[PDB]
Amino acid sequence: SPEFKTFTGYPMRDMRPGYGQNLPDYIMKKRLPNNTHYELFARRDIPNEDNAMYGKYLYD
Amino acid sequence: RKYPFLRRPHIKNTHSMNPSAPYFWSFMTAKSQMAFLPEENYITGDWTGKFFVSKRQVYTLQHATSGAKVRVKSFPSIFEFNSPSRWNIGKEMNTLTKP
Amino acid sequence: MHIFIRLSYVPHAGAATIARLSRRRIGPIGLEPHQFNVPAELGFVEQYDNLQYKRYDWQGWYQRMLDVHNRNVSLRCRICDLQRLDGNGVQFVDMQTERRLRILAQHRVGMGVLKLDADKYEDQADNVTFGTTKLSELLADARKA
Amino acid sequence: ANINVVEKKKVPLVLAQMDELGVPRTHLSRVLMDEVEDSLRKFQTYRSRFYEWGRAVKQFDFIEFRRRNGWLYDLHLMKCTTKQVGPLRDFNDPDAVQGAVATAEIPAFFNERPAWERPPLEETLYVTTNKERYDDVRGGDIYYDD
Amino acid sequence: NFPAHFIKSAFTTDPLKEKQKARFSSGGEAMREVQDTEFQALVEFIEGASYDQLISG
Amino acid sequence: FPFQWKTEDWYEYEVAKVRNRRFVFENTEEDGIRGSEVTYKIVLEGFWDHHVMKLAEDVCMFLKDVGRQIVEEKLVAVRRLLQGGAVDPELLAAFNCARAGPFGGLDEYDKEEVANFLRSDLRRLEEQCLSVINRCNVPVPGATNIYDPHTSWPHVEKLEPWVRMAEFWTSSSDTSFTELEMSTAHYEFRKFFRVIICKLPFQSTEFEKRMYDIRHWLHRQTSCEFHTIYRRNVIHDSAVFPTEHDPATPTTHEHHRMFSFALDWQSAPVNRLSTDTVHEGESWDAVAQRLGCSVGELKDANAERETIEAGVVINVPVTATRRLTSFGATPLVLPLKRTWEEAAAILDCTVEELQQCNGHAALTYQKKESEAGEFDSSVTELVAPLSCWTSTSESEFS
Amino acid sequence: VSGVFSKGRGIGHEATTSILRYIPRARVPWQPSRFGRENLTAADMARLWSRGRYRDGPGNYNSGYCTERTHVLEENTVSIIPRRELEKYMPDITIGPKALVTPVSLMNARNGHRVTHDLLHSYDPHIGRLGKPAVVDHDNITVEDPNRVGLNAATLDCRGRIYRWLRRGPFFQVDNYFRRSVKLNRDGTLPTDFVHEAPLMRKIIRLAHRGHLKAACEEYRRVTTVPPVEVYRALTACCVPGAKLADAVSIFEDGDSKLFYVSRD
Amino acid sequence: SHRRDYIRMGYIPRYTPWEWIAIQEADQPLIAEQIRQDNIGTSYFFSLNRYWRYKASPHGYIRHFENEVRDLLQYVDGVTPWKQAQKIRTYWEVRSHHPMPQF
Amino acid sequence: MLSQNVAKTTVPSYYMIRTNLPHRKPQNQWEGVYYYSGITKRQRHLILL
Amino acid sequence: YYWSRYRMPTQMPKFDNEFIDPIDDKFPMSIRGPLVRPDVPEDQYVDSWYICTSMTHHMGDYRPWSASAPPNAFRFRP
Amino acid sequence: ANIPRSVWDPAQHNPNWSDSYGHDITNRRAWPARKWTVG
Amino acid sequence: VDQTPFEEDQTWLLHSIPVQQLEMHHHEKDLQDLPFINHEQFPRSLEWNAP
Amino acid sequence: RLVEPQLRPQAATDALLARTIAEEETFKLKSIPHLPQNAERFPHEYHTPTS
Amino acid sequence: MRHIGQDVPKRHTHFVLESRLMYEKSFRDCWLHSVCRAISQLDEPLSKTVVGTHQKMLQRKVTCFQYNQYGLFKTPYYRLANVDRYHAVQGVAGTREWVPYVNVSYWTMNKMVRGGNLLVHRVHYTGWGTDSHLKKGGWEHRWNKVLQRNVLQYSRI
Amino acid sequence: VGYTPVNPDTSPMVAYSQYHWHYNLPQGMERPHSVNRTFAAPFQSNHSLVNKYRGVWIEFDMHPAFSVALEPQLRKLPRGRTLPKTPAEE
RNA sequence: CCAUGAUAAGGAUUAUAAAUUGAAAGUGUUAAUAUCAUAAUCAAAAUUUAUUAUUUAUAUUAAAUAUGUAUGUGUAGAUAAAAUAAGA
């Protein structure tokens, strides 16, 4: 509705109270986390920063 | 201290109250009764012996028919489900502990 | 009027060949009567890092992530460009064919432009052929009217 | 450096145009094919090789090759800037002192001293060695040239 | 404990460094590379009303 | 005036305006600012707004010079072509390719007409190149408007920055929740973008290279991404994607189910057989009638064969309307009256595939091939593997 | 002395160590004596590996494979229920090692992986290596893991292995697996004589000669080894009648520059 | 190069000289497939069923994995036995032995 | 021994903990990625022959 | 060394609540003007990081409002 | 040629291109506001 | 057999319709976690227009 | 035509799940009741995940 | 091994390193687990080709395989412990304890902001910030805008 | 400060300190580095070439007429990268 | 077991009149606490364990396990908070 502040022109909700990740419809229409921000974090958020670029022993 | 809804950091803080007669199935169990039993009810590989069954396993008739001892982890060291009965069928072990 | 139409109207194959001659428009061109050359445009994103994700080990997977994120390929084709005579001698899409195509593409058509965004495969090289295949399927089903 | 070397970067473009036009690539002279191969080696790569080029091991192997061949001047991880450049005091308004705001590694020929204000044929007439002092220096100049 | 910063300009210059500094930077090189009190005070004060200055006490 | 509307129309207009944003055809035939062959959008990203602004100005001036050079050389080539040229025989053949023209017959296009069409295209290209050069020669240092498409080429347009607020507690002391909430500060991560648009009336590989190589000399802590929108030609042939009647029994909703795409739907296009085995008694015209194609088309497809023998492998014309489809729906049945090896040999299929396709035969048969032959009586007919099934001229059409 | 391990063994061969001892070795200046994971004995290595996967693997006592008959907790020891008694009320659905390994075509969908194990089994001989180069066998995938080719973050030298694993390029697993599995023979012949795919090659040949190019390509999608030149020859021959020049060029290039120039015929 | 006041007098250029442009362009190679060129067309029956190492791997949603789903189904059917798979029970099958199974 | 292997790292001390000095120089944004496009001094002889 | 870069010394200047200069801060507001920076177009200022002030992306070199609008523009409008 | 000749060839010189200082001096200039005796 | 959307409030109120008792789950917003935990792999502009 | 040309035949998926067919024929699985006896008696307890 | 040589001031910093393995295993086993769960739970017929007892047996075989998958990572992400990579401080996502973009705890983020280690722009502590999406609806509105940019703008052929 | 060293790449303090480039500057290129063109290096991969012949070549440049003539005998003899199983004595 | 930094509490005062819609939030210290640079024998998975700002009477459990105990005429002592798009 353009009369609302949060108007976006796209339906952002499914309007189903009984909706969860367990059901096969959600499984089929969901998005896998491959090559996502999760994958970026899993390799970038290393406790030692100077180990994703190069090995410490090789650099030394 | 407040935490996101249904994302409490405590996992065992859930106190399973006395089972409610009117539902008794849509509470602490699977949302649908046509779903398969969880993995804890089955044996995946060749083990050397289970120390104690987890509390997420559902109760079946074979628990009382086979006669094998079953036990879970609670506030004491261990709790064995002595004197097996048939009234608690289709329910998980967490609903019969009262921590 | 016939002379004016003769001097103005260009066949699809002739126009496509002239485009690839002078304006260097890449793309295969079919000279068979059963083949119809469809003018279309393609859109994609190419990005290469230059700040801190180069010259080291993490650069490779960062670039792979960028390519996978930008794998989308958008193919745009105009209905006015489709409304041309084919090799057989009839209009490639008529009013009924256009109406059927618009019904088949509920939201993929808009402002008179048929847009298909393919994210099917990790690389644009396969996204483009998937988009062309699906557009060919859609055109084959829409010409049924 | 020599800037005309970039003219070989368009060789793959003209080779692609030859393939589009139908001109054989193998119908060229052998010497020109050797130069074309050199140009393609200099300015040609694929996505497969780009996804794994510039690894740490490859860069450090390049550094080791440079060390073996004795050319470590242009390598970022190996270059060391021991000499610095101070400001120039202006005869107008000499009562104000200045200070640095940013530091850049610019080559020597930008601020090289005039030829007449420099010993002639310095490179052969003199031997200059840059080395660090063993004793502690409060003032500075860790690396001095004798 | 506290590192020595030596903010004095006479405690941070030595002849060994000055020998190499003088050749590159000297008076000739710098020259080569570079190009009514009441009324004066009043105009100094009122020039702060420029578009690039502020009125100062 | 005043403006009064209805709510349904207003809602529909707003939603349509929001939806129809990427449905813009950038490369058209219009003269002026819009209308070109290729469109390049360079998005420059920086930590600071003035950084990205100055980078945009520098890249815009560089691309202005490069585009002026490239368009100048293209204009020289266009003028030389317009002065005089030879019509390409391939181009003339391409023009003379429609079986029926816009006048109910062959299109007798000659060199004069093809040259006239080429000249019209070259005149349009010259006008576009002149427009590009004139719009590029405008921005002198005295008066430069880099954001105006008319004033400067290539022009730059703004884009909303990416601002992401982080909200976190700042009290290291593990005091009460109220104190922690009171000690809350807001900081934000910002990223500023500028978009440079180059609309060239032709495809320029050299210009593409010169614009790709700007990432090597971008400003400090600045990145760039490239968007390309170029005209392309797509061939839609009526052979791999033909137009025909809907099947006699239409598919129902049961064919469109969850996981149905991987179970009861092939990936288009479907394999239509181009080879054909001529049958006994079929004549030259009879084969064409059976395949639903003209005799001329059939002989053009197979002209190396003067005559068609009783059994020969010929090539059907590509535009035939009665082409069969591989793996015909009718199953293939083998009657043995005998072992598994013999059945595999006579069906030209592997024994493992035959066993897995039969299924019940494997269950019935014991270890010995003699026992398999004994159970062959109970098993009766054996279903051939799917790879061995053959289509028929009447087992595919209603 | 507070030694963590009572015993240790060398890894170098007795024929080469006795001669190499005369050549001085440059040790690490801040830690000359190095006692890595390889130098551990068999029993110590087994205990350490079992303890490593305490969260998800058999490291937890109740998880399984604990080989201990009683557990002491809360000052009250409790005996262990055996598997024979457990399976009375827990129906066994064990498949064996054949379940953990997925087919080769699922590597791309599983992000360069085949084995569905608790630990990530790298295909390079440098992460899961223990003295010998790391080799992953899909027919012997077991929880006990006689070969320590898996990747866990609780061993003696786990930090470097995790760093190397997280610092990997694209197509690392797929490239390592393909390069190690398929290579040119020392005789110079093409690796196109395998028996596990020969029936598939014959099937593709039959489909191509029958004219089912789509079916032949669909079957070719599932091949794991380098196909023989006959497959490419038949595919191109069956593409000839359809004038499918694009398909013919694509099938030629798929074997020319990618698979040892097999299609160069 | 002729300028001697590059940073001594703060002569920071706001435009990168063509010499530096040429040096930076010639420093790095060019992606061969960065150039778009095709005349044969699109492989309708190929270019997606390629070799597994260089295959057209889908991305994102499960609906794009029609081949992977088929391979997974075939593999699981081959490997798991029905005599073991029949031991999985549903909740209503378990609860049918309850004193009050349904209300 | 060649006189170009300068000791970039300083002498170990408490400075590396007490001060905020970086332990490496920042990456050079305008430095190209190193790649091998040379001749082994023998390929030239081979091609000449 | 790597740290040899971070050793250039800066010489002290040559002379002849907290943080505030009393003489400039206590100047009357109605005379000093309610301004803390030159009144030039705001596009020239960037919020300084780690400092609670606004500096100019061009070091000094302030441009007046008339340097952004067309000549003889009304209210500096385009 | 990687360097357009419109940057070094005097035959393609731009007469209208000013120097690098005049525009900056002019737009830096702030003329006095007392053009008229009132206001 | 199907029913068109109801026209009377009584049908909507008395019909067997549940409410949202657990966390809201979205197929595309399974990533980005929840509001205040919004995740972005790339800091692109929010109104980014794809080609 | 009889049916859609781009339609997978039954044998294609029968080859995909051949062993299931052999096992079901060996074990003589006439049917597998997914719902209990008086399932429709209680219209709210037995809800499928697709309901 | 046990506090002989660790080279780090905080030994808990290895938990981040081992949690990266959890994320990698999730990336490995997300597709298989999701497909198995969908096939097992789906009750309506899969397709025209397979119906009835064949579908029931396929579902039971699929769930048996899924249960036999030992080590398959099937864990909700909110159950994963979040600890900053620099100081091993644990934070709860969805609260001020954790910063999503930096992926560090509140203490680490505050330290890096008070020092010169992160480039952030300070705004008012009790406002919405510069972003128009935040000022025009807040966290949920910016969430929806991010979703619209990422997904709900393509044609999705 | 601290056992963990600061990152000189993303730290605003070191990025905008006196010894580096502030953000209120033109932000142009500092220097046009050219390494590969001044001194290139040969391609030396630690892994062996996967497309080499892995054997000894004989340069079977037989005349075409004789090759056609002796082809039935030559099928037993090895061809390019193909080794038939015909016994040597035969 | 690192003792050292931040935070909590938290205040200052010039704007005459005309015009203009304008020209308008700022912190020491004392305190407590703590995960940082500084002094070896042991907290983070098996959680009961008591940790300030909550839904009160027309309709009340469908999808990750998600609360059965305090109705009592809203009846003490202490404590905190604000002059901020509101209307002392």
From TrEMBL, chain B:
This is Uncharacterized protein. It comes from Trypanosoma brucei equiperdum. The chain holds residues 122 to 220 of 246 of the full protein.
TrEMBL record, chain D:
It comes from the Eukaryota. This is Uncharacterized protein.
From TrEMBL, chain K:
The lineage of its organism: Eukaryota, Discoba, Euglenozoa, Kinetoplastea, Metakinetoplastina. This is Uncharacterized protein. The chain holds residues 11 to 49 of 631 of the full protein.
UniProtKB/TrEMBL annotation, chain M:
This is LysM domain-containing protein. It comes from Trypanosoma brucei gambiense (strain MHOM/CI/86/DAL972).
